[PDB]
Amino acid sequence: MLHPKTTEIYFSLNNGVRIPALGLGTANPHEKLAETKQAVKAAIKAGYRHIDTAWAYETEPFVGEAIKELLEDGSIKREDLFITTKVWPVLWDEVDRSLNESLKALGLEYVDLLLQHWPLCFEKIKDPKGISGLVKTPVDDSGKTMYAADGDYLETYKQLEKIYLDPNDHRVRAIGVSNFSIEYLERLIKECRVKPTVNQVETHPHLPQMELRKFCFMHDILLTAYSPLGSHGAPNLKIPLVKKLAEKYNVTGNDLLISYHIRQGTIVIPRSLNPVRISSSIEFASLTKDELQELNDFGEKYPVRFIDEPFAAILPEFTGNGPNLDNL
C-alpha cells in the first residue's frame, strides 16, 4: 500500500541522533500497568521503533519485559529501538539514582533519551507503597503540593548534562526536557551548556502551541507532542474538522491527529493499550499548509489544556484547574 507509514519517519536531534517520529506512550492507568507489556509488543511488531516511558509511570518494568521477550525471540535488536524515559520532580537532585532505577526497571544498559519530566522540585516523603519508597506527588494536610524549598529545577538538567558529557558513561544517548515554557528554556540556554534535544509538551489541535514551536525551531530543539488525542477518552477524535480531514486522506482519526504533528516536524507519542488500534493507525495524512492553518486556527479559538494538574499551578502557563470543559 501507501508510504511512508508514520512508523517509517525519522527526525534528527541536534546532536545528530535520529528519533522515530512516532512513539508509543505508556502513562497507563495504575489499574492496567501490566497491560503495557502486550501494547509495547504489539507496537513494535507493527513497526514502532520508539517507546516513551518515565520513572513516575510505573510501566518501565512492563516495557522492559516486552523488550526482553522480543530480543530473546529475535523479533528486534536493541540498537533498532529508541527508548525515552524521564526523571520525576521527587528525584530532582538525584538524577544518577533515577536513571539507574529506570535502567534496572527496564532491564536495559542504556536509554536513548533521558528527560527532565517537569521544571519542578518535590520534597521526598517516605511511603513504602510508593515508587522507590517515596510519595509520587506529595501534598500537605491543606491539600497543596509540597515543593522543595530552595530547590532549583535547573539542578536536574545540570545533573543530566554531567551524565551525558561523561565520556566513560554510556547510559544515555541524548538529554531533553518536558513541560518547559519559553522563559524556562531561555534561562536553561543562558545558564547551561547542552542544548536540550527535545521539549516534550502537550499539543494538538486544541492546544497548537504556536509560540513554543517557533521558539524551539529557532533554537534547535524538537517538540515532542504528548496527549495528542487529548488524554482520557480521546476527546480530540470528536473535533469535527479532525473527522473531516481524516475522511479526505482516507485515514483514521488517530492517523490524522498523529499526522498533524509529524507534518509540522513534531515527534508524537499517542498512548493506547489496544493492540489492533496501535497496529492499524500507522497511516500518514500529509496535510496542506492551509489545512494545518485551519487546525491551528481552531486551537487558537478553542484552547483546551487537558494536562494541568494542581502540582503544576506554580508554573506560568499552567493553572492547576485542569481543562476548560467549555471549549469542547
Ligand X SMILES: NC(=O)C1=CN([C@@H]2O[C@H](COP(=O)(O)OP(=O)(O)OC[C@H]3O[C@@H](n4cnc5c(N)ncnc54)[C@H](OP(=O)(O)O)[C@@H]3O)[C@@H](O)[C@H]2O)C=CC1
Q: Which residues are part of a known binding site for substrate?
A: 117
The grid coordinates listed for 176 are 531533553
Q: Which is nearer to ligand X, 117 or 261 (CB)?
A: 117
Asked if 180 and 266 touch (Cβ cutoff 8 Å), the reply is: no
Q: Which is nearer to ligand X, 22 or 76 (CB)?
A: 22
Q: Is 220 in the site for a second copy (CB under 8 A)?
A: no
Compose the 172-211 pattern: x for residues touching ligand X by CB under 6 A, - for all others. Answer: ------xx--------------------x-----------
Burial call 206-237: b when 16+ CB within 10 Å, e when fewer: bbbbeebbebbeebebbbbbbbbbbbeebbbb
Residues within window 38-77 making contact with a second copy, judged by CB under 8 A = 47, 76-77
User: How far is 258 from 287, CA to CA, in rounded Å?
Assistant: 11
> Which helix H or strand E contains 185, and what residues bound it?
helix 182-191
User: How far is 53 from 66, CA to CA, in rounded Å?
Assistant: 13
Q: Is 230 in the site for ligand X (CB under 6 A)?
A: yes
Q: Which one of residues 6, 26, 156, 181 is an interface residue with ligand X (CB under 6 A)?
A: 26
Q: Is 226 in the site for ligand X (CB under 6 A)?
A: yes
Residue positions forming the annotated binding site for NADP(+): 227-281
Q: Which one of residues 30, 289, 301, 316 is an interface residue with a second copy (CB under 8 A)?
A: 289
Q: Which is nearer to ligand X, 137 or 296 (CB)?
A: 137
- Chain center to CA of 10: 16
Q: Is 9 in the site for a second copy (CB under 8 A)?
A: yes
User: How far is 178 from 86, CA to CA, in rounded Å?
Assistant: 9
Q: Is 307 in the site for ligand X (CB under 6 A)?
A: yes
C-alpha dihedral, 307 to 312 to 315 to 318, nearest 10°: 30
Residues within window 240-279 making contact with a second copy, judged by CB under 8 A = 250, 262-265
Q: Which is nearer to ligand X, 170 or 232 (CB)?
A: 232
Amino acid at 282: I
C-alpha dihedral, 321 to 274 to 71 to 12, nearest 10°: -50
What residues line the site for a second copy (CB under 8 A)?
A: 1-4, 8-12, 16, 18, 21, 47, 76-77, 80, 250, 262-265, 284, 286, 289
What residues line the site for ligand X (CB under 6 A)?
A: 25-27, 52, 117, 178-179, 200, 226-232, 234, 237, 254, 269-274, 277, 307
